[PDB]
Amino acid sequence: PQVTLWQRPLVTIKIGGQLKEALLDTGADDTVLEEMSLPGRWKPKMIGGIGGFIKVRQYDQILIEICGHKAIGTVLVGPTPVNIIGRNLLTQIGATLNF
Amino acid sequence: PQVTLWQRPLVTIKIGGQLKEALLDTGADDTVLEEMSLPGRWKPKMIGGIGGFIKVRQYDQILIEICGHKAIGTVLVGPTPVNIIGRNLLTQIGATLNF
C-alpha cells in the first residue's frame, strides 16, 4: 500500500485472531500492541519512550495482517494506548520511506 | 531519498542552528524534540504516549533540515528522549510508506 502523509497510515491489523487499528510507526523498532489476548511465547520487558516506560511481552512469530497482507512479526504486548507497526513489521511488508 | 535498508531511518537534523539525531517517527503526527533552544513563538502542549504524558513546546515554522534537506515544520520541544520527526515533517519531504 502507498501511504502519502495527509492522513494516518492506520490499518485493521489481525494479530492473535484479533483486529485493532494499528499505527504504522517507523519511529519504533518493533510492533508494540495495547494489552490483549495473545497466545504464544513471549518475554516480559519494559520499553521507555515518551512520558515513561511501560511493560510488554515480546511475542516473536505472530501473524499480523496489515491492510490484508500477511506479515508475521514480534508484537510486544503491553499497556500501550495504541498499536505500533515498527521496523520489525516494516521489514515484513517491505516498506520503503521515499521522500 | 528512497530508504529500504530495513534499518532505523535516522538523520542528523538541524533545528534552531543546532544538530541532534532524528528518528523518522511516522507513528507520531508532528516533530517532537528533546529540550533545546527555539525561537520565541511557541505554544505549550502535552503529549500522552508510551509510559506517561510529557510537556513540550509546539514551535511552528522551524527550519529543520533532514539529511541535508532544508525543511520547516512544527518542532515540539519538551523532555522527550529523542528528536521525533512525525508526519508534520513527512509532508515537507514528501515521504511515502510504500510496502
Ligand SMILES: O=C1N(Cc2ccc(CO)cc2)[C@H](Cc2ccccc2)[C@H](O)[C@@H](O)[C@@H](Cc2ccccc2)N1Cc1ccc(CO)cc1
Ligand atoms: O512513546 C512513543 N514512542 C515510544 C516507543 C518506544 C518503543 C517502541 C517499540 O520499539 C515503540 C514506541 C515512540 C517515540 C519514541 C521513541 C523512542 C524514544 C522516545 C520516543 C513512537 O515512535 C511514537 O510513534 C509514539 C507511539 C505512541 C503514540 C501514541 C500513543 C501511544 C504510543 N510515542 C509517543 C508519542 C506521542 C506523540 C507524539 C507526537 O505526535 C510522538 C510520540
